[PDB]
Amino acid sequence: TLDVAAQCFLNSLVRETKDWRLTEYQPTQLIIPLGEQQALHFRVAYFSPTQHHRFEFPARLVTASGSHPVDFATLSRLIVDKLQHQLLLPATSCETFHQRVMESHAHTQQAIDARHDWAALREKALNFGEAEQALLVGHAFHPAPKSHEPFNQQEAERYLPDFAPHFPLRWFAVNKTQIAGESLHLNLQQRLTRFAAENAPQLLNELSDNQWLFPLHPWQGEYLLQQEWCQELVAKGLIKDLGEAGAPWLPTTSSRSLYCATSRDMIKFSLSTLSVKEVKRGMRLARLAQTDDWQTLQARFPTFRVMQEDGWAGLRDLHGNIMQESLFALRENLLVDQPQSQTNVLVSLTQAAPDGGDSLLVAAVKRLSDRLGITAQQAAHAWVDAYCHQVLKPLFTAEADYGLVLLAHQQNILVQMLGDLPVGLIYRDCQGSAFMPHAAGWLDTIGEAQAENVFTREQLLRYFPYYLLVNSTFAVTAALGAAGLDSEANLMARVRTLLAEMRDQVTHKTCLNYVLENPYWNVKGNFFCYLNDDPSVIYFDFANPLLA
Amino acid sequence: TLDVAAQCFLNSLVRETKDWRLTEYQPTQLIIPLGEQQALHFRVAYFSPTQHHRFEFPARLVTASGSHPVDFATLSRLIVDKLQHQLLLPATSCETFHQRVMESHAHTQQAIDARHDWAALREKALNFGEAEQALLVGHAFHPAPKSHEPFNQQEAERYLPDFAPHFPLRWFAVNKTQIAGESLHLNLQQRLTRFAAENAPQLLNELSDNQWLFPLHPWQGEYLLQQEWCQELVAKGLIKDLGEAGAPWLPTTSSRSLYCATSRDMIKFSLSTLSVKEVKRGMRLARLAQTDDWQTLQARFPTFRVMQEDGWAGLRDLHGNIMQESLFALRENLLVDQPQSQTNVLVSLTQAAPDGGDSLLVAAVKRLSDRLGITAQQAAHAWVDAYCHQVLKPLFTAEADYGLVLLAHQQNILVQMLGDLPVGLIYRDCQGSAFMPHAAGWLDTIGEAQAENVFTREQLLRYFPYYLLVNSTFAVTAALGAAGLDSEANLMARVRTLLAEMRDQVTHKTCLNYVLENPYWNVKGNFFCYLNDDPSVIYFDFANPLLA
Amino acid sequence: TLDVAAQCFLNSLVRETKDWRLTEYQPTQLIIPLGEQQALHFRVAYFSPTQHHRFEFPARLVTASGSHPVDFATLSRLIVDKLQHQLLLPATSCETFHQRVMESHAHTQQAIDARHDWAALREKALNFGEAEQALLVGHAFHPAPKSHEPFNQQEAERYLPDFAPHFPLRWFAVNKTQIAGESLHLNLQQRLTRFAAENAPQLLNELSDNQWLFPLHPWQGEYLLQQEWCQELVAKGLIKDLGEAGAPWLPTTSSRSLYCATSRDMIKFSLSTLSVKEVKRGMRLARLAQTDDWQTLQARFPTFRVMQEDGWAGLRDLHGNIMQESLFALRENLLVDQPQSQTNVLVSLTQAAPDGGDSLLVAAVKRLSDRLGITAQQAAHAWVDAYCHQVLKPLFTAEADYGLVLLAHQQNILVQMLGDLPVGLIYRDCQGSAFMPHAAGWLDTIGEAQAENVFTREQLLRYFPYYLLVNSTFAVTAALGAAGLDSEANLMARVRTLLAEMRDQVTHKTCLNYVLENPYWNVKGNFFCYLNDDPSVIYFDFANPLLA
């Protein structure tokens, strides 16, 4: 049996602590001592060199008297008690931590009960929107991944991707004086006009030189009209609420971010939160993408694309102050012309399946196997190799030759597949971009050398390898390992060899050297991080499995 | 102005003769002496290092008196007179040659007059069937490419791809005794059943244990019922003609070969001609594709696919003799599940445009340029580079590491594109396959070591580089050169560099060494070849443009 | 608030009993006396002249002391106690009845909890398969509609339309000796071949002169292999189980009947039950549909179609006995060529919505209103009028002029709509057909005059008006009444007028006279019928609302 939410709490704990035992004898068990001649025993179904373990449940508690099973509420409390005393922590922040752990475990269990169609996602190639909504648990190494903030069941079933919903946007007619924002190619007025024409043309009778159409998340729209600064604007005749109208939008893995298959733009709302600084990161990268060196990079990696966030807008109050709770940014919908593209977000492919069966990555590889007439293992190798050439090669070369750092969270990576094989990469979330000192000459050509989002070498090596290799790439290899298509050790040797070849084709070797040569990667953890809101406990040393 | 049919006759002549002049001064002219103080002058619009020239017409004839224009009938006759005397040739075979040259020039001109929709093919990505029927002249270096044999206008407008037609197949109910053939996966009876169920289910009331459904080309069907051996079978009750029925089929570049978007099989008819030996080449390669080494090759190049010809059938007469005029072979329709795939046959992309505008390759590259925001030249480089990795790399590695020779006529190469960029290769026409001595151990595992279709080293070097580089790859580079996206010299340097890297990744270097190092490629020509039906005139030495 | 399952039990009770009270004063209440100075009170949200009432819950129980709410378990038990004593019934059959009432109420409540997507079905025109699976409660006047027999949750979530599932069929290779059945147009062998080729072509390697492919429901397949007679066939080499394979099938309102959008045939399984006599009714009507009078009828009503059941098959045991638990019948898929047709089963349109909002009929009419720019009420009138011309006119004229009786259960009527307006009728379930004495001459032309499924005049008037007017037509008018688009009295006056015109266009007036003129329709009820497994209690007199 299994419990996927529980497995996240345990794999996160095991990855960030040294005090556990792995039995030499079989049936293999993993043991967490609790002190007091007491310890939790877990039958191991899959032991992972990267801590993507799968345990059989129930857990058992072994005392001096005997052993008895324990449910997840009990084992998580025992563990948090041990850490409370071991680390001398406030009982209050421990109670908060365990409370949040149990809420996430309930939110996750309910999302599973609602999605009885999930297994059927294994049947055929998923398109972009199907992949965005196939994600039931999004953080495999977080104690409490799923939070419904800020919704309430009925509101959570309409607005969270967990439940595969869709809905129309809410709209205001807003006086041009109360609208702030920017846009590339089209100015702001033309962007709001094109957006409204595509997604709610029937409101175009409300559009004038001075009255513009302003989209809103439906919950966030309700929320703003309850605020006082916004009721003033309504009273003064500067905002008229138009209600919900237009094409269906569906929440993606981010939930603030919405996809509409017929809109040239995706949309990302401040949802109870964007900031003006965050949207400036999008505009900076968008303006940087107009330069000749960006063009040279694109010409070198034609299958590699960034979804630019080249427009944003927000509501000003009576004093002219931009009210950040009203912000949105606009993201190029590179899939508007091919809405059935097999472009899938990496985290949905790699997540463990709620029913214990094949992950959606594994289902894709087995179809690859069948279509080509090659073994499961040979398909697994072909998919890992293409992943490295389509995902890892552009991202390392971009940092190395151009100074552009793109933080590749697993939900920021869209694998463009053709017949279940990676043929391209699309990166999204331009707020996860940063610039190295050797990009300064190139930032300066657009007047952005003093850009706020720069990295030191130390920051590069702390985050970029952690997101791209630990979180993203080893989710691919662990997921293929757990299905037995081949082992993680063998699949990570694939990756190691293809990274070594890449190093030969780049100028600045610093990042690949660390990846290929340093025995430990100091990375910022999640389990103890979230138990705050200690010093060397939030950070931990990750043993490099790529080292010769 | 221009004349594409004429340009084929001249470029073929110029490529296989040394007796012409290229003026040092401008406007650039190409001069062919005719003897007798007489010579043809051609204003040159595009001079090509690989002889893909484009001339402005009319041609002019320069005598001691003056110059006057000449039409294509006159210049082709003057040229054939000169070769008649220069080579002391029979006036009869020269008259035949010029007669066939003029018929091809008329057939080509009529195909142009019928296809007024052709320019609109530039507008968007073509799918497989659109690309197959976009071909108006298929042999850029043949004196007389277009022959309508064996049809007559109305019959040529229904059965030739030139006119973009479609039609249903003709069908016989045939006694099992009079059917010969084979099939893999399904036996012959199950293949004829699956074929008829998919393409003419309404004839399934004619299907029994002993009476099987037998497809026929519609013209070839009419032809066989006029024959005597077949009227006997009808008289004896062994064949009942069922007429034409079922799904629409459209002729491809081959015209004998038909495509139906809903059939799992394509079909290739003996058309007035297949032979039993030819279809055995398909079955041999199909059986070879079941082995573990084929599997290893497929796993190494997952984007590379062969359309196997793993079934065939034919009619036996009363004596049991297979009547080859009734043969067909069945070709996997790898596009049945994705009929809108941008998989396009290479010759349709590279052909010169009948109206003098962009070739369909160039239209695709300009869209690539626009979608990615890179220059025309940068898109041309990206497309050449992907072509080498998707087309040239699998074909050289297959010969080198496995001993499998696939003769890559330009109409045998299907470029699988995604957004106008090559992402894969599909090879078709298994009759153009052959085996090298180092494939004997592997042929022997399926009992095929004594296979009729083997090559010597000499045959490898005469044909494989000519088809893959001279005909296919330099059609790509010349076509991009002629549009001015960049020069052939620069684009062929791209190819040279990517071939050198390939040599490092293969065992048997013989074929790449010749490609990269020999200064001349002795190849079998077309212009003088077709003037027969002399010894060292059919062959000529091609100067290697890839040599350092 | 409301409870749709409860509303079925109460509306069924109220329709078949005279002992209730409707308060003259408001808020309107409906009162059911329980005897003993005790009675159930229901606040009425919608009072219906045809008993399609909607009550607000909770119910209340009023005693001599006071009143207190009661849940559905309590009020259904009180009612069944009263009927037990009032009718002097066995306590055992009353306990069984209440047990089944509560199970249906639970099965219905769970189907609602699973379908959170249901409200979104209101958004746009439904196609055939969406409409088949939109049905959560199928019998508005039955005490216990939903039974899961014979499944168990996980099996019920895979095989019942309530949960919108889909699945592949299970398949046997069966020796021709052990297959019985028939088919029109194609013989049985050709039908099983065409069916298997379309839906599981990859099993065609198992198809031979003597070994035929035999489809099975997946649960029914498992069930037969557990039986002894079938294990013998496996032991003797006469049946080889091939497992599940092929295209997805989805259960329709019947659950035994499956739809596959790409199959030319629908399929109807004996599921734990068809009989040979039942499938002979299909073949008889199918053979009758080949005659010239059928043709004349079709030519008179071109928008009226019957889905013929013109083939069936079953497994014989070692003794040659047809094992009816293996039967299936094959139903023409008239939608195979237009799978997005807005053809919807009438019961899904008319059912009350689980969330208390618009029924799917009402959603369609409101879209009709919007598209045409006419009021909601004018659209309701247009839809009722077209319903009468497209549904009622063909069915009465068929009985009257041809003697063909088609029993129009609401789930047997497919309303072919174009832009939310009825433009045609498709009838299915040929087992609900019967023949009047004046069809004997026409039955005799196909040798079927002694047909088992004939009606007397008495049977005609008991069933045909009940199914076509009480169940089907008044579900349409009540559903439009309950939304307030116009009243049932006014909408039933529409129907009355259009029926009177029909009578002028037909020969045998007997059925329309009864519909238009008799003050009471004696009909067979459901509430007390199902309390058995009394004499004049199963039957009741329905007051004709169409009487002048």
Side-chain angles (χ1 to χ4, degrees), chain C residues 72-76 78-87 89-94 96-98 100-110:
Chain C
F72 177 74
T74 304
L75 67 80
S76 66
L78 292 177
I79 291 170
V80 173
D81 289 344
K82 182 180 89 171
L83 297 173
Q84 181 170 350
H85 296 80
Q86 180 180 353
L87 298 176
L89 294 170
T92 55
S93 60
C94 289
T96 295
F97 176 79
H98 186 268
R100 293 178 180 173
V101 168
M102 293 305 299
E103 292 173 346
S104 182
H105 182 272
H107 301 308
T108 297
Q109 185 55 59
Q110 98 186 54

Short mmCIF file of all heavy atoms in Angstrom, two decimals, chain C residues 72-110, unseen atoms left out:
data_model
loop_
_atom_site.label_atom_id
_atom_site.label_comp_id
_atom_site.label_asym_id
_atom_site.label_seq_id
_atom_site.Cartn_x
_atom_site.Cartn_y
_atom_site.Cartn_z
N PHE C 72 -34.27 11.55 5.44
CA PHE C 72 -34.96 10.68 4.48
C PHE C 72 -35.10 9.25 4.99
O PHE C 72 -36.11 8.59 4.69
CB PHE C 72 -34.23 10.70 3.12
CG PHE C 72 -34.85 9.77 2.10
CD1 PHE C 72 -36.06 10.10 1.48
CD2 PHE C 72 -34.24 8.57 1.77
CE1 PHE C 72 -36.63 9.25 0.54
CE2 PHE C 72 -34.81 7.72 0.83
CZ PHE C 72 -36.01 8.06 0.22
N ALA C 73 -34.13 8.75 5.75
CA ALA C 73 -34.26 7.42 6.32
C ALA C 73 -35.50 7.33 7.19
O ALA C 73 -36.23 6.32 7.15
CB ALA C 73 -33.01 7.05 7.12
N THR C 74 -35.79 8.37 7.97
CA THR C 74 -36.92 8.33 8.90
C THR C 74 -38.26 8.47 8.17
O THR C 74 -39.22 7.75 8.49
CB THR C 74 -36.77 9.42 9.96
OG1 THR C 74 -35.52 9.25 10.62
CG2 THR C 74 -37.88 9.31 10.96
N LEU C 75 -38.35 9.40 7.21
CA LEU C 75 -39.65 9.62 6.58
C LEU C 75 -40.02 8.45 5.68
O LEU C 75 -41.20 8.10 5.59
CB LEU C 75 -39.69 10.94 5.80
CG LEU C 75 -38.86 11.20 4.53
CD1 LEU C 75 -39.48 10.59 3.29
CD2 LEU C 75 -38.70 12.69 4.35
N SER C 76 -39.03 7.83 5.03
CA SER C 76 -39.33 6.68 4.19
C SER C 76 -39.76 5.48 5.03
O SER C 76 -40.59 4.68 4.58
CB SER C 76 -38.13 6.33 3.30
OG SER C 76 -37.00 5.88 4.05
N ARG C 77 -39.21 5.34 6.22
CA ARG C 77 -39.65 4.26 7.08
C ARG C 77 -41.06 4.50 7.61
O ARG C 77 -41.88 3.63 7.56
CB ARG C 77 -38.63 3.90 8.16
CG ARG C 77 -38.78 4.58 9.49
CD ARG C 77 -37.76 4.07 10.49
NE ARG C 77 -37.80 4.79 11.75
N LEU C 78 -41.35 5.71 8.07
CA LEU C 78 -42.70 6.05 8.52
C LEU C 78 -43.73 5.74 7.43
O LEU C 78 -44.77 5.13 7.70
CB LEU C 78 -42.78 7.52 8.91
CG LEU C 78 -42.01 7.92 10.15
CD1 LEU C 78 -42.13 9.42 10.35
CD2 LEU C 78 -42.55 7.14 11.32
N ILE C 79 -43.44 6.17 6.20
CA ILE C 79 -44.36 5.94 5.09
C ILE C 79 -44.56 4.45 4.85
O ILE C 79 -45.70 3.98 4.71
CB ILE C 79 -43.85 6.67 3.84
CG1 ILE C 79 -43.97 8.18 4.05
CG2 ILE C 79 -44.63 6.22 2.62
CD1 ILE C 79 -43.29 9.02 3.01
N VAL C 80 -43.47 3.68 4.84
CA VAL C 80 -43.59 2.24 4.57
C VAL C 80 -44.31 1.53 5.71
O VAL C 80 -45.06 0.58 5.47
CB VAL C 80 -42.20 1.64 4.29
CG1 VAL C 80 -42.29 0.14 4.19
CG2 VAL C 80 -41.67 2.20 2.99
N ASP C 81 -44.13 1.98 6.96
CA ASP C 81 -44.95 1.47 8.06
C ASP C 81 -46.44 1.71 7.81
O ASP C 81 -47.27 0.82 8.02
CB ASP C 81 -44.55 2.11 9.38
CG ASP C 81 -43.22 1.63 9.88
OD1 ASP C 81 -42.73 0.59 9.37
OD2 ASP C 81 -42.67 2.28 10.79
N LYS C 82 -46.80 2.94 7.39
CA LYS C 82 -48.21 3.26 7.16
C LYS C 82 -48.80 2.35 6.09
O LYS C 82 -49.91 1.81 6.26
CB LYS C 82 -48.37 4.72 6.75
CG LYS C 82 -49.83 5.05 6.56
CD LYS C 82 -50.16 6.48 6.14
CE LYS C 82 -50.19 6.69 4.64
NZ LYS C 82 -50.73 8.05 4.30
N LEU C 83 -48.09 2.18 4.97
CA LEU C 83 -48.57 1.31 3.90
C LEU C 83 -48.61 -0.15 4.34
O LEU C 83 -49.48 -0.91 3.91
CB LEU C 83 -47.67 1.46 2.68
CG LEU C 83 -47.69 2.86 2.07
CD1 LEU C 83 -46.67 2.98 0.98
CD2 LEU C 83 -49.09 3.17 1.53
N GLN C 84 -47.66 -0.55 5.20
CA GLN C 84 -47.69 -1.90 5.75
C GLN C 84 -49.02 -2.18 6.43
O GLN C 84 -49.69 -3.17 6.12
CB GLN C 84 -46.52 -2.09 6.72
CG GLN C 84 -46.42 -3.46 7.36
CD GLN C 84 -45.11 -3.65 8.10
OE1 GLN C 84 -44.18 -2.83 8.00
NE2 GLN C 84 -45.02 -4.74 8.86
N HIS C 85 -49.44 -1.29 7.34
CA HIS C 85 -50.69 -1.48 8.09
C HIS C 85 -51.91 -1.19 7.23
O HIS C 85 -52.90 -1.93 7.28
CB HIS C 85 -50.70 -0.59 9.33
CG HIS C 85 -49.64 -0.92 10.33
ND1 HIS C 85 -48.33 -0.51 10.18
CD2 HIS C 85 -49.69 -1.62 11.49
CE1 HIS C 85 -47.62 -0.95 11.21
NE2 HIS C 85 -48.42 -1.62 12.01
N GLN C 86 -51.87 -0.10 6.46
CA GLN C 86 -53.02 0.27 5.63
C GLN C 86 -53.37 -0.83 4.63
O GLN C 86 -54.55 -1.08 4.37
CB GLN C 86 -52.73 1.58 4.89
CG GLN C 86 -53.86 2.06 4.00
CD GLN C 86 -53.52 3.34 3.29
OE1 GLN C 86 -52.49 3.96 3.54
NE2 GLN C 86 -54.39 3.75 2.36
N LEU C 87 -52.36 -1.49 4.06
CA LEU C 87 -52.57 -2.51 3.05
C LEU C 87 -52.37 -3.93 3.59
O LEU C 87 -52.42 -4.88 2.80
CB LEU C 87 -51.65 -2.26 1.85
CG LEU C 87 -51.84 -0.94 1.09
CD1 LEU C 87 -50.79 -0.77 -0.01
CD2 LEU C 87 -53.26 -0.83 0.51
N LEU C 88 -52.15 -4.07 4.90
CA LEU C 88 -51.86 -5.35 5.56
C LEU C 88 -50.82 -6.17 4.79
O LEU C 88 -51.11 -7.22 4.21
CB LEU C 88 -53.15 -6.14 5.79
N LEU C 89 -49.57 -5.67 4.81
CA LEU C 89 -48.50 -6.26 4.02
C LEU C 89 -47.50 -7.01 4.90
O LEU C 89 -47.33 -6.70 6.08
CB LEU C 89 -47.75 -5.19 3.22
CG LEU C 89 -48.57 -4.49 2.14
CD1 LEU C 89 -47.82 -3.30 1.60
CD2 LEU C 89 -48.88 -5.48 1.03
N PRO C 90 -46.81 -8.01 4.34
CA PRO C 90 -45.77 -8.72 5.11
C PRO C 90 -44.66 -7.77 5.53
O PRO C 90 -44.12 -7.03 4.70
CB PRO C 90 -45.26 -9.78 4.13
CG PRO C 90 -46.37 -9.96 3.14
CD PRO C 90 -46.99 -8.60 3.00
N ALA C 91 -44.32 -7.79 6.82
CA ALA C 91 -43.21 -6.98 7.32
C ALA C 91 -41.91 -7.26 6.58
O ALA C 91 -41.05 -6.37 6.47
CB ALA C 91 -43.01 -7.23 8.82
N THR C 92 -41.74 -8.47 6.06
CA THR C 92 -40.51 -8.84 5.38
C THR C 92 -40.37 -8.11 4.04
O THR C 92 -39.32 -7.52 3.75
CB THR C 92 -40.46 -10.35 5.17
OG1 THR C 92 -41.64 -10.77 4.48
CG2 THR C 92 -40.35 -11.06 6.51
N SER C 93 -41.42 -8.14 3.21
CA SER C 93 -41.38 -7.43 1.94
C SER C 93 -41.36 -5.91 2.12
O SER C 93 -40.86 -5.20 1.24
CB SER C 93 -42.56 -7.85 1.06
OG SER C 93 -43.78 -7.56 1.70
N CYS C 94 -41.87 -5.41 3.25
CA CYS C 94 -41.73 -3.99 3.57
C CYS C 94 -40.30 -3.65 3.97
O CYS C 94 -39.76 -2.62 3.54
CB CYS C 94 -42.71 -3.58 4.66
SG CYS C 94 -44.44 -3.55 4.11
N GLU C 95 -39.66 -4.50 4.78
CA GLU C 95 -38.26 -4.26 5.14
C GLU C 95 -37.37 -4.30 3.90
O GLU C 95 -36.51 -3.43 3.71
CB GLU C 95 -37.80 -5.29 6.18
N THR C 96 -37.57 -5.31 3.04
CA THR C 96 -36.85 -5.36 1.77
C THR C 96 -37.06 -4.08 0.96
O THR C 96 -36.11 -3.52 0.41
CB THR C 96 -37.32 -6.57 0.96
OG1 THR C 96 -36.95 -7.76 1.64
CG2 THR C 96 -36.70 -6.56 -0.44
N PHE C 97 -38.30 -3.62 0.87
CA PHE C 97 -38.60 -2.42 0.10
C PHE C 97 -37.84 -1.21 0.65
O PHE C 97 -37.19 -0.48 -0.11
CB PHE C 97 -40.10 -2.18 0.09
CG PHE C 97 -40.54 -0.93 -0.59
CD1 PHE C 97 -40.62 -0.87 -1.97
CD2 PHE C 97 -40.93 0.18 0.15
CE1 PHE C 97 -41.05 0.28 -2.61
CE2 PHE C 97 -41.36 1.35 -0.48
CZ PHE C 97 -41.42 1.40 -1.86
N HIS C 98 -37.89 -0.99 1.96
CA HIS C 98 -37.21 0.16 2.55
C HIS C 98 -35.70 0.01 2.45
O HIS C 98 -34.98 1.00 2.22
CB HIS C 98 -37.64 0.34 4.00
CG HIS C 98 -37.10 1.57 4.64
ND1 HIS C 98 -35.91 1.58 5.34
CD2 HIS C 98 -37.55 2.85 4.65
CE1 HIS C 98 -35.67 2.81 5.78
NE2 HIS C 98 -36.65 3.59 5.37
N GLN C 99 -35.20 -1.21 2.61
CA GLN C 99 -33.78 -1.45 2.41
C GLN C 99 -33.34 -1.03 1.01
O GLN C 99 -32.31 -0.37 0.84
CB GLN C 99 -33.43 -2.92 2.66
N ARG C 100 -34.13 -1.39 0.00
CA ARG C 100 -33.75 -1.05 -1.37
C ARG C 100 -33.89 0.45 -1.62
O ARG C 100 -33.07 1.04 -2.33
CB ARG C 100 -34.58 -1.86 -2.36
CG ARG C 100 -34.26 -3.35 -2.32
CD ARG C 100 -35.12 -4.17 -3.29
NE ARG C 100 -34.80 -5.60 -3.24
CZ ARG C 100 -35.48 -6.54 -3.88
NH1 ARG C 100 -36.54 -6.22 -4.62
NH2 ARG C 100 -35.12 -7.82 -3.76
N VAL C 101 -34.91 1.08 -1.02
CA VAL C 101 -35.07 2.53 -1.11
C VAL C 101 -33.85 3.26 -0.57
O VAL C 101 -33.39 4.25 -1.16
CB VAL C 101 -36.35 2.97 -0.37
CG1 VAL C 101 -36.37 4.48 -0.22
CG2 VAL C 101 -37.59 2.48 -1.11
N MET C 102 -33.32 2.82 0.57
CA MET C 102 -32.16 3.51 1.15
C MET C 102 -30.88 3.26 0.34
O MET C 102 -30.03 4.16 0.24
CB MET C 102 -31.97 3.10 2.61
CG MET C 102 -33.08 3.57 3.55
SD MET C 102 -33.30 5.37 3.46
CE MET C 102 -31.69 5.98 3.98
N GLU C 103 -30.72 2.07 -0.24
CA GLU C 103 -29.54 1.79 -1.05
C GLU C 103 -29.51 2.65 -2.30
O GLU C 103 -28.46 3.17 -2.69
CB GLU C 103 -29.51 0.31 -1.45
CG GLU C 103 -29.28 -0.64 -0.29
CD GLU C 103 -29.43 -2.09 -0.70
OE1 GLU C 103 -29.97 -2.35 -1.81
OE2 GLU C 103 -28.99 -2.97 0.08
N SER C 104 -30.67 2.81 -2.96
CA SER C 104 -30.75 3.66 -4.13
C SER C 104 -30.42 5.11 -3.77
O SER C 104 -29.68 5.79 -4.49
CB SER C 104 -32.15 3.53 -4.74
OG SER C 104 -32.30 4.30 -5.92
N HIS C 105 -30.94 5.58 -2.63
CA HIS C 105 -30.67 6.93 -2.15
C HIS C 105 -29.19 7.12 -1.83
O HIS C 105 -28.67 8.24 -1.97
CB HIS C 105 -31.54 7.20 -0.92
CG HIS C 105 -31.38 8.57 -0.34
ND1 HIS C 105 -30.43 8.87 0.61
CD2 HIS C 105 -32.02 9.73 -0.60
CE1 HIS C 105 -30.50 10.15 0.93
NE2 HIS C 105 -31.46 10.70 0.21
N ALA C 106 -28.49 6.07 -1.40
CA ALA C 106 -27.06 6.18 -1.18
C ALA C 106 -26.29 6.12 -2.49
O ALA C 106 -25.40 6.95 -2.73
CB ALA C 106 -26.59 5.08 -0.22
N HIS C 107 -26.62 5.15 -3.37
CA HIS C 107 -25.98 5.09 -4.69
C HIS C 107 -26.12 6.41 -5.44
O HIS C 107 -25.18 6.87 -6.10
CB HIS C 107 -26.56 3.97 -5.55
CG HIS C 107 -26.43 2.59 -4.97
ND1 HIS C 107 -25.23 2.08 -4.52
CD2 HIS C 107 -27.32 1.58 -4.87
CE1 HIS C 107 -25.41 0.84 -4.11
NE2 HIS C 107 -26.67 0.51 -4.31
N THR C 108 -27.30 7.04 -5.36
CA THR C 108 -27.52 8.32 -6.02
C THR C 108 -26.68 9.42 -5.40
O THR C 108 -26.10 10.25 -6.12
CB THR C 108 -29.00 8.68 -5.97
OG1 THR C 108 -29.73 7.70 -6.69
CG2 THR C 108 -29.25 10.06 -6.57
N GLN C 109 -26.59 9.46 -4.07
CA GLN C 109 -25.82 10.50 -3.39
C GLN C 109 -24.32 10.41 -3.68
O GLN C 109 -23.66 11.45 -3.76
CB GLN C 109 -26.07 10.46 -1.89
CG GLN C 109 -25.39 11.59 -1.16
CD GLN C 109 -25.80 12.93 -1.74
OE1 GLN C 109 -26.99 13.29 -1.76
NE2 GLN C 109 -24.81 13.67 -2.27
N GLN C 110 -23.81 9.20 -3.82
CA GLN C 110 -22.42 8.99 -4.17
C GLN C 110 -22.13 9.39 -5.61
O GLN C 110 -21.11 9.98 -5.90
CB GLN C 110 -21.96 7.58 -3.83
CG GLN C 110 -21.94 6.59 -4.96
CD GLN C 110 -21.60 5.20 -4.50
OE1 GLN C 110 -22.23 4.67 -3.59
NE2 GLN C 110 -20.60 4.59 -5.13
#
